Every structure is written in C-alpha cells, then in structure tokens.
Design a protein around this ligand. Structure first.
Ligand SMILES: [Zn+2]
Length: 105
DNA sequence: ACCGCTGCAAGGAATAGGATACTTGCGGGCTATATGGCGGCGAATACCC
C-alpha cells in the first residue's frame, strides 16, 4: 500500500489534531477497585473502553450499541484495541524547550 | 381542739460489683553525596601572533 515514510516537526495545532482528549490528573488506579480514575493519566473517556464493547459504568454492554457513548461516562463502546492507538495531549502552562534540539552537539 | 407520742423518711460509718470513661499499639490507607575504562573525534575555547 504505502511506499514512503515522511518525518518532520509537529506544530502544536497538529498535536491537538492527533489527540483524543486532555489529561489533567496525576492519578491512575484506586488499588481497591481496579477501574481507572476520572480523567487521570489512564482513563476511559479519553483513551477508550477497558473491555470489548463494554461501557465503563455498565449502562450498555453489548455490541448492538456500537458507536453510541454513555451519558454518564462518555466512553465510546467499541473494541479495546483503541486503547493502544489513541493518544492524549497535556496542556503546558508555560512554554518549554525540547531538549533534543538544545544539547544535540 | 390541743399535745406529746409513734412512726416514717433524710443523712453519717462499714462491705461487693458492673459500667463506662480512658489509654494504647496497630494496619491499612495515603502522599512524594562518588572517586579501578579507553579510544576517536568533533566542537569549543586558548594562545600568541
Ligand atoms: Zn457508562
């Protein structure tokens, strides 16, 4: 299919284009109930469902409801492979300098 | 038709016994200062003109 690999820099707008949400909380797992956090580093509303065609809260749990989202979780009921291909984006309060383009010698 | 009496409670000294306020160690729940390796090489100073 494809024939060439292109590589370049990524403007902030394009980075927003890639992302499917924003991370805001440094918390990951409860250690008691192994569901993810609200919108922490892991998440369901940002990255995707945890089980194949399973909304997080369990309002819909069948493949018949593919595509629709939950009205309390907002997750996209679909395969869990999406959890390996969606990317988040953090917002940085201050501008910062890429280290590679600074001490590359 | 008036009174001193008996009698029936209220407050002191000696024992047993549960209730209950008090004290304590934990278990899980949470948050946040090195000193024996070379070799190559290229960039970045130093230098003395
Ligand atoms: Zn839900």
């Amino acid at each position: 299919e494809f024939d060439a690999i292109k590589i370049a820099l990524a403007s902030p707008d394009m980075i927003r284009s890639w992302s499917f949400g924003e991370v805001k909380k440094p918390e990951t797992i409860n250690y008691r109930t192994f569901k993810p956090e609200r919108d922490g580093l892991f998440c369901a509303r940002i990255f995707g469902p945890v089980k194949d065609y399973e909304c997080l809260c369990g309002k819909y749990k069948r493949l018949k409801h593919r595509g629709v989202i939950c009205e309390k979780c907002g997750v996209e009921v679909t395969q869990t492979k999406v959890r390996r291909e969606r990317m988040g984006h953090i917002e940085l309060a201050s501008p910062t300098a890429h280290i590679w383009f600074l001490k590359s010698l």
